[PDB]
Symmetry: C3
Subunit: 48 residues, 3 copies
């Protein structure tokens, strides 16, 4: 599927961006990711 | 944007909550986050 | 709620799948998860 391939390219681009980040920057990013997913899980746990 | 600032406040609140969790609780939370994102990625990989 | 219980079962199934993965496979999966969430955060940071 087209959209599937586009998503993989978006993911690979983000991985290349992440590769340039320092160890501490990566930890800050991972923390942000965890917090965002948890906010998403809560707001979803409300309507679903 | 308003919604953007609101999201950052939601993320900061979640970060403050995470900061109070023990190391083992944090590992349990990260595991849950990983599993949830993968479920989301699959269900999305179906409609998209 | 029904959908809530279904989500927990989906998450537990994914956790069981993750448990079978090697340490290196788990790192690859976590990297993919981080990149996907960041793509999601960007595309959301555009419409919201
Ligand atoms: Na660099
Ligand atoms: Na504490
Ligand atoms: Na195994």
């Amino acid at each position: 599927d087209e959209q599937r391939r586009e998503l993989e390219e978006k993911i690979k681009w983000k991985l290349a961006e992440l590769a340039s980040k320092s160890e501490e920057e990566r930890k800050e990013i991972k923390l942000r990711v965890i917090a965002y997913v948890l906010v998403q899980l809560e707001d979803l746990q409300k309507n679903l």
